Every structure is written in C-alpha cells, then in structure tokens.
Ligand SMILES: Cc1cc2nc3c(=O)[nH]c(=O)nc-3n(C[C@H](O)[C@H](O)[C@H](O)COP(=O)(O)O)c2cc1C
C-alpha cells in the first residue's frame with residue numbers, strides 16, 4: 001500500500017494478537033473496533049460483538065483475581081496486564097493474556113482504551129504439564145527409596 | 150479524522166514487534182519498526198532502518214527456516230518460521246516471524262508486514278516437557294528391568 005495510513009491499517013489487520021479499541025460509556029467499555037485476530041481468537045464475527053463490553057468473553061466466570069486488578073487499573077487510568085479465563089463462541093475455555101492501555105484524547109476530552117489479546121492456552125498447558133511430570137518424577141524417587149528402605 | 154491516530158496507537162502499544170519492509174533489489178529493507186521491535190532486539194530504530202532484518206541472525210546462518218523464508222519472499226507468499234536471533238548485546242532469543250508480502254500494483258512496489266514474537270519461554274517449556282517425558286519413561290523402565 002501507498003501512504004502511512006494504509007500501512008498502519010495493514011499492520012493492525014495482520015497482527016497475530018487480537019487488537020481492539022474501546023470507549024468509556026457509563027459502567028462499560030464499549031468495543032468500537034476489533035481486528036481479524038480477535039474474531040478468530042473468540043469465534044465471533046465483528047458484527048456480533050461490536051458495541052458491547054468485552055466482559056461477555058467471561059461468560060458467568062466473573063470472579064477472577066485478574067478482573068479486580070483490571071477494574072482498579074481502568075479506574076486509575078493506568079495500563080495493566082492480566083491472564084483471564086475466557087470462552088470462545090463454541091464454549092471452549094482459553095487463557096487470554098489481556099493488555100489494556102488507557103489513552104486520553106486532549107482534543108475531545110474523551111478516554112479510549114487499546115486492548116491487546118494473546119491466547120496463552122498452549123503455554124499454560126505446557127507449564128501445567130511440566131508440573132505434573134515433575135510430580136511424577138518425585139513419586140518415582142519416593143518409590144526407588146521405598147525400595148532402598 | 151481520528152482513526153489514523155488510533156491505528157498508530159494500536160501499533161505502538163502492540164506487544165509483538167511489528168515492522169514494514171520494502172523490496173529493494175534482492176533484499177527487503179525496513180522502512181518502519183514499532184517500539185516493541187526496538188525493545189525486543191535492543192536496537193534503536195535509526196540504527197537499523199533501511200537495512201534487511203537478516204542482521205538479527207548474526208553469524209547463525211545454518212538455519213533451515215532462512216531458506217524457507219527466502220523462497221516465500223521470492224514467490225510473494227506469506228510464511229511463518231521460528232529463527233534463532235540475537236539482540237544488540239548478543240543474547241540469543243527464539244523469534245517467531247510472520248511475514249506477509251503485499252504488492253501495490255499502482256506504484257509497482259512490494260511491501261512486507263512482519264510480526265515478531267519472542268517465543269523463547271514457550272520453546273524452553275516444550276523442550277522441558279519432552280525431556281521430562283523421556284526421564285519418566287527411563288525411570289519407569291529401570292523399575293521394570295530384569296535383575297539377572
Ligand atoms: C480495551 C479493553 C479490552 C478488553 N478485552 C477483554 C477480553 O478480551 N476478555 C475479557 O474477559 N475482558 C476484557 N476486557 C475487560 C472488560 O471489558 C471489563 O473491563 C472487565 O470485565 C472488568 O470490568 P467489570 O467488572 O465491569 O466487568 C477488556 C477491557 C478493555 C477496556
């Protein structure tokens with residue numbers, strides 16, 4: 001593409017992480033843009049989820065420690081980064097490393113939020129698998145020693 | 150309008166490295182890097198703009214993914230490969246690279262979008278799983294092994 005605006009759009013559309021912009025409206029942060037990676041990550045098309053609060057990705061799983069941290073940071077206008085349990089349209093659980101950055105528009109006096117979403121399910125599963133295997137090694141060490149004593 | 154500023158903020162607060170390159174002869178030279186790419190590689194943008202990204206390989210050129218990337222760029226198709234890369238201070242990291250060629254038929258120039266992710270932590274975890282699976286299998290075999 002030609003100008004730098006077209007290149008900025010290409011960069012956002014080809015990002016592997018989800019990228020969204022929300023706008024403060026009362027008690028919700030309303031989605032006003034989602035990129036293709038977010039549609040693929042969540043299983044929803046943009047027309048289905050634009051102009052909603054993204055909390056719907058939690059389903060009924062609302063009492064998560066990272067949720068209170070996000071709330072406090074948004075309240076204070078500070079960036080944050082937390083891993084949450086979210087659910088795709090098909091219902092499957094995935095682990096979402098969410099990065100939120102508040103940005104204040106000095107022209108219109110309005111606050112926007114940049115959100116970056118990364119599916120870290122595979123890394124979460126791998127680390128759980130390491131811990132399970134380490135526990136199995138510990139049991140094999142106990143068993144070699146119960147055979148030595 | 151205000152959407153161009155938002156596009157810019159989206160790219161600048163991305164956690165992955167994001168770059169644009171342009172075809173120039175037989176190589177692809179950087180014309181834009183975002184802040185995460187500078188933090189990821191350890192280089193300031195001004196020191197590496199208008200260079201080909203292959204400098205991140207150092208002298209570590211015997212990697213199969215390099216030829217795969219080269220051929221994909223040669224054919225104008227996207228690709229994705231994990232390479233060993235080196236920061237300015239020399240430290241190794243595993244770089245998962247997503248490259249998308251985009252041809253501008255009006256100005257007859259080819260651009261490339263590149264996404265860079267440090268996957269060092271995930272590579273080490275998957276290796277750790279394979280090593281532990283082998284350890285568990287050998288320890289169980291030793292418990293089963295004949296005593297003759
Ligand atoms: C830009 C942005 C992106 C967000 N993305 C997600 C998301 O992908 N998944 C999720 O569960 N919550 C996401 N949230 C959080 C919810 O929108 C909401 O802030 C959170 O659940 C805490 O507020 P609440 O207690 O009113 O629900 C995002 C918030 C913002 C501002």
Ligand SMILES: Cc1cc2nc3c(=O)[nH]c(=O)nc-3n(C[C@H](O)[C@H](O)[C@H](O)COP(=O)(O)O)c2cc1C
Nearest residue numbers: 170177201202203205206215218219232261262263
């Ligand atoms: C947009 C773009 C981004 C790239 N980013 C990297 C990178 O971060 N690390 C790397 O080792 N190679 C990267 N490359 C690949 C090298 O630039 C080069 O294409 C590759 O080494 C194969 O070409 P060569 O055989 O001439 O070295 C990138 C290529 C493009 C087009």
